[PDB]
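Sanity check. The docking grid for 2-acetamido-2-deoxy-beta-D-glucopyranose depends on where the pocket ends up, so I'm generating a full predicted complex first rather than guessing from homology. Inputs follow.
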Amino acid sequence: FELLHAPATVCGPKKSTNLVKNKCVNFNFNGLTGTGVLTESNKKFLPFQ
Amino acid sequence: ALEPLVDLPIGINITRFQTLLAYYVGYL
Ligand SMILES: *[C@@H]1O[C@H](CO)[C@@H](O)[C@H](O)[C@H]1NC(C)=O
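Predicted complex below; grid placement will be based on this.
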């Protein structure tokens, strides 16, 4: 094993849950976090955003 | 606007480059 300053390219299994829309919930997407009511959108992101 | 295509974790200290052959170049 070695870790360093750790510009990592390998990790083990990452967790997940079902998607709980329309409730106040404590959330993590891709490692970005907050608390809120998640809900469906008319907004049109670009494919990389 | 230019949009991201490729994003490579590789850790190198780049200081030179070359083309594999009109074609321009400008430094950020
Ligand atoms: C890049 O430069 C840094 C300067 O601190 C050095 O620690 C590192 O080993 C260098 N890496 C390569 C691949 O040259």
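Relevant for the grid: Strands of chain A lie at 24-29, 32-37.
Also worth noting: Chain A is about 0% helix and 25% strand.
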